[PDB]
């Protein structure tokens, strides 16, 4: 009654010379089924807690596959344990072949990078009160609407420059909502694999234009989760 912890799905064979280690230090295997390669390890439990430790093990199996050449992949969300290969075939594979082939077409030769921009939220709020209009530092609804809309403008002036100036090196851009209070941009870019060096330098030359006003967090190597999504197919019962 060991199930299968699944890490990702790849279009090509992965050789056994690619040594890999996963959750609980289990060895990681590949398993080809009709031209789809599933990277997996033996699951001891049915469920794994998303502890910091386990999330790192999961993330590194896929990153290590990418470092070894297997850059096109659907990466799976942490925790995916299925009972047996029959269930992998009937539920995960058979109904999804076409979407998985399309998806491998879109990702081939491409990579996800991310850009998170932070500013000093407090400082830029007080700096904005000192601007062109300056009230005294109910109709409380009106005034809290006017600050919130003029704050958005001040963010969006920064954001827009980064978006106009990086978008030309990318095939697709997906923006997500701020995680922290200081975060003003959280964007994933899908770029040709060989655009990374120029992208990296472009990010840096844009930042130089804003002086020490921003913190930039650029991740240049990650499994492509934002751009590898599978919509639901019909399942008969």
Numbering used by the authors: 2 to 138, 151 to 250
Quote the study on this structure.
Gas vesicles (GVs), a unique class of intracellular bubble-like nanostructures, are found in many aquatic and soil microbes including halophilic archaea, photosynthetic bacteria, and heterotrophic bacteria. As previously reported, formation of GVs is related to a conserved cluster of 8 ~ 14 genes (termed gas vesicle protein gene cluster, or gvp gene cluster for short), encoding two major structural proteins and several essential minor components that might putatively function as chaperones, nucleators and regulators. In addition, GvpF is reported to be a structural protein localized at the inner surface of GVs. Here we found that Anabaena sp. PCC 7120 possesses an intact gvp gene cluster, which shares an organization similar to that of previously identified GV-forming cyanobacteria.
To further investigate the putative GVs of Anabaena sp. PCC 7120 from the structural point of view, all Gvp proteins, except for GvpA and GvpC, were successfully overexpressed, purified and applied to crystal screening; however, only the crystal structure of GvpF was eventually solved at 2.55 Å resolution in the space group C2221. Anabaena sp. PCC 7120 GvpF is composed of two structurally separated domains, both of which display a fold in α + β class, followed by a C-terminal tail inserted into the middle area of the two domains. Further structural analysis showed that the N-domain of GvpF displays an architecture in which a six-stranded β-sheet (β1-β6) is sandwiched by two α-helices (α1-α2) and the helix η1, whereas the C-domain adopts a modified ferredoxin fold owing to an extension region consisting of three consecutive helices (α4, α5 and the N-terminal segment of α6). Moreover, the additional C-terminal tail provides an interface for the N-domain and C-domain to pack against each other, resulting in the structural stability and correct folding of GvpF. Superposition of the two structures showed a very similar structure, except that GvpF of Anabaena sp. PCC 7120 possesses a shorter helix α5 in the C-domain. Besides, structure-based multiple-sequence alignment revealed that GvpF proteins are highly conserved among diverse species of cyanobacteria. It indicated that Anabaena sp. PCC 7120 GvpF might also function as a structural protein involved in forming GVs as that of M. aeruginosa PCC 7806. Moreover, structural combined with enzymatic investigations suggested that GvpF and GvpN are structurally and enzymatically conserved, respectively.
